[PDB]
Amino acid sequence: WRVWLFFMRGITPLLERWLGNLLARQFEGQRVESHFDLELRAAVMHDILDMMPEGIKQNKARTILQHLSEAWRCWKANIPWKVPGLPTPIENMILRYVKAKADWWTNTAHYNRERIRRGATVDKTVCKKNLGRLTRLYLKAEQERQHNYLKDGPYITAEEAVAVYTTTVHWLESRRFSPIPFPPLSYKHDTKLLILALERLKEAYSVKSRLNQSQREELGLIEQAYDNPHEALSRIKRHLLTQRAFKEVGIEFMDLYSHLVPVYDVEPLEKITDAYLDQYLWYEADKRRLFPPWIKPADTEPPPLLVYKWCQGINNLQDVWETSEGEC
Amino acid sequence: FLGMPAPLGYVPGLGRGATGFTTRSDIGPARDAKDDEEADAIYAALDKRMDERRKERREQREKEEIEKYRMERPKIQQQFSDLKRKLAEVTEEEWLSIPEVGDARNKRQRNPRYEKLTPVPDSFFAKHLQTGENHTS
Amino acid sequence: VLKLLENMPMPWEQIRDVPVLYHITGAISFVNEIPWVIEPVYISQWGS
Amino acid sequence: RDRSIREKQSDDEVYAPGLDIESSLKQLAERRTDIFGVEETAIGKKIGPEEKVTWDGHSGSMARTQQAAQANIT
Amino acid sequence: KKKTIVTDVFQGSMRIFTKKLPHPDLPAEEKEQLLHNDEYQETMVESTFMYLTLDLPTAPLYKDEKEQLIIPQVPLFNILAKFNGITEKEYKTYKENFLKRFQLTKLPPYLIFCIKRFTKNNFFVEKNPTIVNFPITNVDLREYLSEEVQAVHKNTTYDLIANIVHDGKPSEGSYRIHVLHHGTGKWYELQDLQVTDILPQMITLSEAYIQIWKRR
Amino acid sequence: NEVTKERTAQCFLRVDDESMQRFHNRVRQILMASGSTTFTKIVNKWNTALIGLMTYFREAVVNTQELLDLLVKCENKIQTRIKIGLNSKMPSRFPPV
Amino acid sequence: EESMKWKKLTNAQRSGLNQIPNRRFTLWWSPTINRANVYVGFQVQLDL
Amino acid sequence: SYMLPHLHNGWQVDQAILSEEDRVVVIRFGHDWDPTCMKMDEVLYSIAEKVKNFAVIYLVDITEVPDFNKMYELYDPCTVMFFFRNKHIMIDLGTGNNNKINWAMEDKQEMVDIIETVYRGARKGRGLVVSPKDYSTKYRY
Amino acid sequence: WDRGIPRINTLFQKDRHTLAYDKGWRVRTDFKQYQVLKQNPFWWTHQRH
Amino acid sequence: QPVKVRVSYQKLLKYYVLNALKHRPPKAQKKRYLFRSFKATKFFQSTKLDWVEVGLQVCRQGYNMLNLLIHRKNLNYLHLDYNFNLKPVKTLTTKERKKSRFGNAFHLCREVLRLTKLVVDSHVQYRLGNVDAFQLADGLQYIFAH
RNA sequence: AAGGUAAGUAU
């Protein structure tokens, strides 16, 4: 009886407020992340329109918001933003708004990324937006790093580079390594390597899927190279000899939910040359003994077999499991 | 039309053939088939009197909490107060001189043509079919 | 609900008259009383 | 060019005009006192008789609602 | 004691004109009458300091039109535009804004400059990477003293003798120090154990955080 | 020991925490990117991921008692996704056939 | 259904067309999915 | 929120629903200051221009216009409702309430899909349209 | 028939001559993650090789 | 003693410890009294009644209030009995089943009024003479244990 | 407690 009375004292307010707001004449009835950006935009626009002498210039109001977009975009795109006709106070407040929104953007992106890494239950749209934010942040950091390298020069001192090069030269001389020559026009394997290279390029399409324009263009290039192997080989050798400039390559980021793996999209025409070069380089480096056995994977031991062989090698060492004299 | 006063004696539900809907019975006022307006006030004042137990002692603590929160995180409008003040030096001609924002990207990026999807060539089925055929020696 | 359940007559009482505050229209009726008891007397009664 | 201008003239205004944008911004600021203003009330409060009769959407109450709307004219 | 070894060496005297800025959302007549009410007028308040805090300009936040990703720099005298009657700083508070223009009175024999980095924004703390453009040999603060005290202080030239620099983000950063050997005139930096001989010219190309100046 | 051909050591295998987290994230991105997707595609992705993990480790699974719980939890998540696709109200005694 | 994989359909139009196989799957296992044992609750019969 | 057209009384909402004969009228009942309403209104503003051909978007303040609170059960913080040729259109969202969308949607593509499906079904004469996405679960994983 | 790590199946594979000139295939398969936007569960092995 | 009574002992101790630990001193207040401001208004009258009579009156009034809540939208295909069980008067259609939904609060109020009805009915049965005083005590104990 | 309302014409 007393237990249910103690329940009753607690449950009375709920029922009272649920009833009194129900049989009365008048009835009464993901926002964290989409909070600061919207409030900041509303506040900046309200301030600008308040100080605007809009008795004559109301039609500029929408235009103002457009600036608040482009500046933000120009910050997100890491491109310069300098409107020539924009008055200095307006530009200053737009810059303040962009700085505040950028601080919130960075903090929100990092917080959401840490949530996802921990295992917080999140939606697909949230994941895509967070991945986009992290891609933008990582690319801004990469631009900073590349600019630092260009401005501050190479970070390897001449002494360190000389030591590394001398060690490599001594190693190559010790092993008696003949350098890999340029692929001859009469190469005995100039066609087998080309077929192997084209097969790897077509492996991305082995699973049946709907083809867009870029994919079918790449497949057409591969088919053209296969139909006329010698013309493709001549183009490949010409690119190897004379091509030092290349078109831009796109970058995306595979989201593993614990980190970001960069993914690079290269032009298919350069992809064929790079694939043939990779196949030829690996075939030559396996013909010769360029890579010593301790470099893995070695095409002969799967990683589990690598672990097995490593454990067996540990166990097979001379008196490895001995500690009589304190050896460890 | 927009910015037009509602005609007098007009029911917004009527004149349009609108029909309501009820997802449940727990939402909305009860359906209806000067001694009342003087009786609602009695219960309202009774509820206010019952709330008067700690109304001053809880609306004062929330005031200090708001002040403490604003000490560290100021309001957004106050974060632009100086800049908003400095807008008084922008003249009307300067206000009119604000340019319209354009888009840099061209037609191929703004409104690209439809990206037709095409089936994978039959040679892929053929090549997948070639694999699995094993030499007898 | 809460007022009458706490004013429940004890096993040693046949009839328990309680003060009632009832709405003038019969809408509601509260048992306008708190079951005050002397704790040694209450414990001895429940021991009996 | 003619058909590009004929469609342009017939185009409507998707967004609000400058006056409507300004009035909506001020009305929003009058309620969100956690962003604007000096004093800070709740999210929806504006700080810091007659009750309109509305149809409940039932065909049985069309006549009474209509007459109450008529009876509210001064 | 009023005059300890720290007061006579590092402490100087500075004057502050604290004017209360009226709330913008007020009528113009109401604004001017509030200004007349003496509630929103300047109040000269003298004070003493151990060091002068120097605010830095905000980062450009954008690439330059010609030289993309150009490091932001500011001349020292632009940073020291503070502490004079001509310039003002709108100090914003969650309650109301204030107009506080400073005016130096007594320059200490050894002046410490603390450059404001590690500013806490609305969401975290960020360092302003702006490069301070200062000379290391000869300056003059006669333009930064009021006319009444300019006669009193016949010396206004300071030489940099010590410089602190912070390398890395505010989350984890190292504190290097460049010290000027008074006897020899050479500059030596020492990061904990490591000691190196940095050229005096290369001192000013660092993100300075704390500096010590000698008036001689 | 290859020389004595005798029992000398003993190797205990276990799935690393990073591999378990990678598998869990793969199952998560299978599940969350499965709104307007056929049940067959979701089950095919789950089967491919599971067979890849199980045929890669093949011994480290049994000792990693946390991996077993992770695998059954992921399988339950996939089956719940399919069941919610079939009907919004969850079943009580859904069959494994 | 296979002919519509390439006919310039909108995103909404294509999204609903990728759920057609499920409509068959539910039909294949209908005698077991649509049961009283597995889905406890009331039953509604189709109008025809 | 402050960019989309606003309707200030019940008669204006009536005329807005009546005026459009070849486009679906999308009306957001709620308050400008409501955070859920701000998210919904910013999504609507994002897709306002793209759906110009087959949709018109208006904003109604229920406190200012309580004219439809009783019939339309406009008591949730945010509500999105579709009309076509003066006829309320229901959507089989899977949420149990087919008469309205009473939550903020993040993705701007999903709202475009919903408007497109509503337009197709209503032009075909239907009064109920099955949404391309089932909202019985937020698909959070 | 299906016993060894390089399955005896591979000795009878039709394209067993072109695969003999395929070197560094495991490293290439591992590095394929930086070119394709889908994670490969069998990143450690090749069915043909 | 068996396992279940021992576990009962540890669980009772757990609840006692949690109450004694998560206890904060009561907050200061201005001592506004209910049932004192009711009789201040001209809406309530004071009398003295047998507790069984008051229980019957409250059961009837709660039934009337729940009945008023049930027929809120003029829907008469949900019937509330005098034992406070809510059942359809007929095989209601699916649209009507949707239209006659109440939240957890309504059913919680219905069940608490059902518990009060059970208690008052036990006391009424005792007062009529159907059950003994010992039987009434055992019935109340069973009611509050189940 | 729900996420289980076919919609459409006609009175």
Coordinates of C-alpha atoms in Angstrom, one line a residue, chain D residues 17-46:
Chain D
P17 CA 10.8 40.2 -51.7
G18 CA 13.1 42.4 -49.7
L19 CA 10.4 43.9 -47.5
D20 CA 9.1 40.4 -46.6
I21 CA 12.6 39.1 -45.9
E22 CA 13.2 42.0 -43.6
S23 CA 9.9 41.7 -41.8
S24 CA 10.4 37.9 -41.4
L25 CA 13.9 38.4 -40.0
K26 CA 12.6 41.0 -37.5
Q27 CA 9.7 38.8 -36.4
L28 CA 12.2 35.9 -35.9
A29 CA 14.5 38.1 -33.9
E30 CA 11.6 39.2 -31.7
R31 CA 11.2 35.6 -30.6
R32 CA 14.7 34.1 -30.6
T33 CA 16.1 36.1 -27.7
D34 CA 18.9 33.6 -27.2
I35 CA 20.4 35.1 -30.4
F36 CA 19.1 38.6 -30.6
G37 CA 18.2 41.3 -28.0
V38 CA 19.6 41.9 -24.5
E39 CA 17.3 40.0 -22.1
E40 CA 16.9 36.2 -22.6
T41 CA 13.5 34.6 -22.3
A42 CA 12.5 31.1 -23.5
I43 CA 12.9 30.2 -27.2
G44 CA 9.4 31.1 -28.3
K45 CA 8.5 33.9 -25.9
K46 CA 8.3 37.5 -27.1

